[PDB]
């Protein structure tokens, strides 16, 4: 879930 939240934010 926060891996991917924080790849999509960049």
Sequence with gaps: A???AL???L
Excluded: G, S
Aim: net charge neutral; proline share 0%.
């Design 2 to 4: 926060l891996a991917a």
């Design 7 to 9: 790849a999509q934010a």
